[PDB]
Design a protein around this ligand. Structure first.
Ligand SMILES: COc1ccc(OCc2ccc(COc3c(Cl)cccc3Cl)cc2)c(Cl)c1
Lengths: 262, 68, 272, 59, 56, 68, 262
């Protein structure tokens, strides 16, 4: 039925008994580069089962006060097994994804989470200096980031944070959040479903790019209807994020990249 | 009254006899009238475990929901 | 196991073909025959290599163990199955890296009175029980393990022709390894040195199990000793990857050496 | 719990998410104490070698 | 038998999210585990078990 | 299930039986089901030593220069 | 001709103008596991170009006094790019190799090196305790080891070295070195060639094995005729070793293995 599914990729399987169908972004399933759209001339590496499998990133907790969370792809998976290895050993890389967000509660809980997949999800910074966010802050990895309820300008001139300041109702980029529904999405309304499943093809203005310099997709999760339970002002339910890269192919092998951190 | 069956050759000698001919067959003849005196042929069959593994009245598919 | 080619007559030569010259750097051996370097006559070859086939080379029962039992815990003995307790068969097997065959075991049993003028006993019956790795090992010459409801046993009556049984290819790999360049464990980073340590070149701690031998008769105060000499013959043989034979004395189950490290004698360079 | 009906019960709770294991086992079907006495383990103890796939079902 | 050369690996279980129950519901519950062989399973070399003994 | 092979007669008796007939043949019958119980037929084949004597990629003729 | 060649694997090419043909061990070219010889049931990973390429291990120097060198495979390549990554991430692994040994001199130099590829190259230890060599010593990695001119028993009972003591004329294993020619080999005689090239198929009694627990091949280099030059008692010529894994396929993916060292 629309509600029961099983996803198998490599050596990993995911089962769900409360789905609300699955979304295939823009109606496009991920695919490899065709010869007619090929650019780099060298033989690509395609790890296949070693990289195209389900990786579970860290679990976040939803509370009445949560504003939202965000992650960047392939960034969030840079340290994930052999996918991360191939990402750092190659100059160029390409991949699609199957994003599976998990969140179960009970029949006496309420709340709705909007799960959006955004191509080129550029976020707003914290200073008066334009495009000032530094690489280390823009790429948090598997832990991702969070949305805020208001904009707060960083004034420390001696030691600028050079970080993002994504305000939730402004979708972290100066647009109204209610219009974010034009992007592939699903809603995890506690009275209806457990999860959200989105299949994302590779989207870019090029056939292949640098995975370290460029993040193709952004995953934004916003509480559309806040978490509430029985009478417990105190309520916490975890949100686990499991993502699997698809049709990975890398070009331009050399020595490994070791990016600067923190 | 000889019964000629073939053996399941495990380790093969560097001979063609190890792959064919009467050299991979064995012969048997019963000498006693009572079947109890006979040896075991050991050409024994198998069966479906279903009577134990799935003694269910209404047959179910693994892909399909068990509780329907 | 067949024929050798005939020698064809060969006359004189004066040509640009020089089979005598070569270059061994390539890793190849020059396939010359007499007629390549001298004038030969025609010889119809009748000799064959029938006895040097891999099968005929091993088609002999070699002693691999001498198990001893004293019918006065020695009332029973246990021998861990191996071909390395003796040197002769071991050296022949080690001309190759891997092997695959069936085995024929023949048991020659001898016994005698320790005392020239004392004691007496009725004819002895022996039980040779195979204990596959995992099965319970006997603690007494008469405990429950000797019931052999599943383990294969051989009951030998003293004085009867040597007992003999056949064993199939029982390896857990596709061939027996005469050499294993590795360990059974990989020590992981962080664990105590006591951890992850194993013997070099060893696979399972108990590869093929062992044999438990005992005299079934009730022991009499008489002093008696018996010895079971185990002979094994590989039949239906296949071998892979030849290796140079052992030149110095064996020093254990491994390729370790210690003592006879100078095997060759002296001989003058220009002395015939 | 060993040697009582409680040896078969593994308890879970509604505590906040933790990354620590609920249970751990070694794939030694004939020797691991938890597997050695199941019908599968009992049969394997009458044989020296085993090969094949296994399946664990949780209720 | 337990032997490193033929070791099989590890089985473990973790919470993906967490067990959630509403009010007036038990907060602790049990799970039972079952094990069986697949259709490609086989054994060989009949031997004696250590699971049965006999004293005297 | 009998296998009848011929012997390679070494020393010949002053008989025609030493040169022909069933007198230079030998008969074999397997009595056991397991091939392990079988004796060795000893009708074993040979092979080309090339895999050891000439494991060279580019095949060379002895008359022709090895180093070319 | 027998003397000029070019080897191309992945993004690496090797050229030689003074070869003496190439040896393909046992006449077998490396290949992948066939379905009829398959054992592990899971889908294998085949890195292909990312792992099957030429990796140059450290250069050793040949002097009049050198006794010989040895390496173990896949051990010597365990830290080599994506080949090493796949080796450590998988329980099982299989690979063949193209070993290219390099050594050039001049027309006034002499010397001959015997390059042997040995399946299951077990070496002798240093103590009275049998099979006492410890894992860390048996697996030196890319630096490999050396042969000695004589056996010297380790007597330090408090701190045993638990190392190998490979005597050269005993081929490091109790057999005469002159008989080592029964193993696939080539000879680098300075007046004839620059290198030795050996193509090694996967050899083992199993179709696939643990690459961390087991070394399939051993490479032994022994000075058959010592290095000599003009009148310089002082002469040193480097010996570089370049090896490329072939037909790599791994099974049993899990978390990465980090072996204990030194
Ligand atoms: C590479 O060279 C090899 C490989 C394996 C070997 O031993 C394997 C082996 C395994 C089981 C048995 C058990 O055989 C027996 C039985 Cl069922 C019953 C009674 C007596 C015996 Cl004796 C005997 C040998 C030997 Cl000796 C040399």
């Amino acid at each position: 039925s629309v509600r029961v599914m099983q996803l198998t990729l490599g050596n990993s399987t995911i089962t769900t008994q409360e789905a609300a169908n699955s979304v295939v972004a823009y109606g496009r399933w991920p695919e490899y580069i065709k010869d007619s759209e090929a650019n780099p001339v060298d033989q690509p590496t395609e790890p296949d089962v070693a990289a195209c499998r389900f990786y579970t990133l860290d679990t976040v907790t939803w509370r009445k006060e949560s504003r939202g969370w965000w992650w960047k792809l392939p960034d969030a998976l840079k340290d994930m097994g052999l996918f991360g290895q191939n990402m750092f050993y190659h100059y160029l890389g390409r991949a699609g994804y199957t994003v599976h967000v998990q969140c179960n509660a009970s029949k006496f809980h309420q709340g709705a989470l909007g799960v959006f997949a955004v191509p080129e999800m550029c976020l707003a910074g914290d200073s008066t200096t334009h495009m000032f966010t530094k690489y280390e802050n823009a790429n948090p990895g598997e832990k991702g980031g969070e949305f805020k309820g208001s904009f707060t300008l960083d004034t420390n001139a001696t030691n600028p944070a050079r970080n993002f300041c994504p305000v939730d109702y402004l979708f972290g980029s100066g647009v109204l959040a209610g219009n974010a529904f034009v992007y592939p999405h699903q809603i995890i309304n506690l009275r209806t479903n457990n999860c959200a499943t989105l299949v994302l093809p590779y989207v870019n203005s090029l056939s292949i790019d640098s995975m370290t310099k460029h993040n193709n997709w952004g995953i934004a999760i916003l509480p559309l209807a806040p978490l509430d339970f029985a009478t417990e002002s105190s309520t916490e339910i975890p949100i686990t994020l499991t993502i699997a890269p698809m049709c990975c192919e890398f070009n331009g092998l050399r020595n490994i990249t070791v990016p600067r951190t923190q | 009254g000889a019964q000629v069956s073939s053996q399941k050759v495990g380790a093969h000698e560097n001979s063609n006899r190890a792959y064919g001919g009467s050299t991979i067959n064995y012969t048997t003849i019963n000498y006693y009238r009572d079947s109890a005196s006979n040896a075991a042929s050991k050409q024994d069959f198998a069966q479906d475990p279903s009577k134990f593994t799935e003694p269910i009245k209404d047959v179910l598919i693994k892909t399909a929901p068990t509780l329907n | 196991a067949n024929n050798l080619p005939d020698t064809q007559s060969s006359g004189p030569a004066h040509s640009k073909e020089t089979p005598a010259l070569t270059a061994v750097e390539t890793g190849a051996t020059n396939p010359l025959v007499p007629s390549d370097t001298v004038q030969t006559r025609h010889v119809i070859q009748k000799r064959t290599r029938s006895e040097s086939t891999v099968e005929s080379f091993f088609a002999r029962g070699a002693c691999v163990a001498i198990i001893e039992v004293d019918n006065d815990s020695k009332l029973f003995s246990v021998w861990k199955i191996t071909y390395k307790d003796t040197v002769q068969l071991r050296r022949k097997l080690e001309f190759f890296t891997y092997s695959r065959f069936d085995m024929e075991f023949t048991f020659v049993v001898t016994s005698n009175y320790t005392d020239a003028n004392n004691g007496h006993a009725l004819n002895q019956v022996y039980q040779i029980m195979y204990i596959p790795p995992g099965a319970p090992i006997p603690g007494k010459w008469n405990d429950y393990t000797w019931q052999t409801s599943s383990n294969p046993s051989v009951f030998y009556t003293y004085g009867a022709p040597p007992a003999r049984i056949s064993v199939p290819y029982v390896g857990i790999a596709n061939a027996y390894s005469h050499f294993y360049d590795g360990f059974a464990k990989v020590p992981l980073a962080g664990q105590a040195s006591t951890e992850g340590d194993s013997l070099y070149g060893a696979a399972s701690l108990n590869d093929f199990g062992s044999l438990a031998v005992r005299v079934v008769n009730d022991h009499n105060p008489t002093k008696l000793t018996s010895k079971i000499r185990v002979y094994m013959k590989p039949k239906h043989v296949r071998v892979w990857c030849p290796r140079p034979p052992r030149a110095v004395p064996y020093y254990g189950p491994g390729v370790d050496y210690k003592d006879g490290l100078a095997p060759l004698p002296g001989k003058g360079l220009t002395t015939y | 719990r060993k040697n009582t009906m409680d040896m078969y019960r593994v308890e879970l709770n509604d505590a906040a998410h933790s990354d620590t294991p609920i249970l751990c086992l070694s794939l030694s079907p004939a020797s691991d104490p938890r597997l050695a006495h199941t019908m599968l383990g009992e049969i394997l103890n009458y044989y020296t070698h085993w090969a094949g796939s296994l399946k664990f079902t949780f209720l | 038998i337990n032997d490193s050369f033929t070791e099989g690996g590890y089985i473990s279980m973790f919470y993906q999210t967490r067990v959630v129950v509403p009010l007036s519901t038990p907060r602790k519950m049990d799970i039972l585990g079952f094990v069986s062989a697949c259709n490609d399973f086989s054994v060989r070399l009949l031997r004696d078990t250590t699971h049965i003994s006999q004293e005297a």
